[PDB]
């Protein structure tokens, strides 16, 4: 609509994925000192199954660590597949071998917790070296045919992949659906993951959230960067 504060949870539950995704891309961005234009109840209408799932948040965000790159990999694979030490070793090797950084400067980079952070290129190199897994990446909004249908553009891009990693690069913080009491927004400069189950339901996994949540692919904010295993 023009004003979303009239939309009810029931109306939103009856909407298609693309209609729900349009609500996200139009109204889910938080303000500087307030929540988005969508309430917890309204976002709850975008949740599909609340039944028991074997999919879980294997990696919660650890105290004081900006290691969502690691958490998203482990949540995407549903295993403790990448330890912290290997995460930090592979990262440091990239700065050392590819960017010419000295040992002393690499160690400062690893150990400065507040300044630490990686990107989708580091992630791709970790996935290639550690797991021999190639990836492709794209912003959702740049996908072929996204303007015609966000849901199907993302489905067609993901293909038969069982997981995807999502990077929210930019300045926006998005309120997202949650199957719990609190809102757990997708914060800026942060990785999350989604995992597909046997019924082709996708489960959204934020290391900063409480539980997995079953949402349509079109719920992912369109500016986010998708990483897809080949």
């Amino acid at each position: 609509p023009m004003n979303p504060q009239w939309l009810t949870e029931e109306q939103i539950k009856k909407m298609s994925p693309d209609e729900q995704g349009n609500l996200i891309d139009t109204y889910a961005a938080r303000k500087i000192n307030a929540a988005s234009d969508l309430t917890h109840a309204q976002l709850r209408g975008m949740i599909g199954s609340t039944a028991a799932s074997h999919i879980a948040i294997v990696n919660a965000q650890e105290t004081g660590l900006g290691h969502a790159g690691r958490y998203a990999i482990n949540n995407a694979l549903q295993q403790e597949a990448l330890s912290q030490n290997e995460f930090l070793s592979l990262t440091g090797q990239i700065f050392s071998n590819q960017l010419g950084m000295s040992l002393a400067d690499v160690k400062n980079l690893i150990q400065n917790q507040d300044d630490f952070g990686i990107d989708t290129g580091v992630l791709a190199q970790i996935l290639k070296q550690k797991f021999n897994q190639p990836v492709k990446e794209s912003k959702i909004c740049d996908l072929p045919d996204c303007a015609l249908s966000k849901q199907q553009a993302v489905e067609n891009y993901i293909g038969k992949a069982k997981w995807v990693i999502v990077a929210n690069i930019g300045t926006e913080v998005f309120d997202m659906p949650s199957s719990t009491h609190a809102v757990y927004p997708l914060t800026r400069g942060h990785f999350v993951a989604l995992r597909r189950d046997a019924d082709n339901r996708w489960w959204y996994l934020d290391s900063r959230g409480k539980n997995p949540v079953n949402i349509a692919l079109a719920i992912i904010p369109r500016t986010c960067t998708l990483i897809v295993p080949l």
């Binding site: 914060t187 800026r188 409480k210």
Partner: protein, 76 residues
């Protein structure tokens, strides 16, 4: 990504919450509920010696990253 704050009880137990500066005290209590099963009406939050009100944000209270809130339950 993301900002973390601490919530400490008199029991000594401390937990890490994932928050934004824009989070209301209401949503913070909801996050404590998700972690501990404690409904918001049984939560009293204190920071800088003041009881926090539901409609104000962390930023409104100048609660920053790694700040510690004190939780005392309201059992009657």
């Amino acid at each position: 990504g993301g900002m973390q704050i601490f919530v400490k009880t008199l029991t000594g137990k401390t937990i890490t919450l994932e928050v934004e500066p824009s989070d209301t005290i209401e949503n913070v209590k909801a996050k404590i509920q998700d972690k501990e099963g404690i409904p918001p009406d049984q939560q009293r939050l204190i920071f800088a010696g003041k009881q926090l009100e539901d409609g104000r944000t962390l930023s409104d209270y100048n609660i920053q990253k790694e700040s510690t809130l004190h939780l005392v339950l309201r059992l009657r």
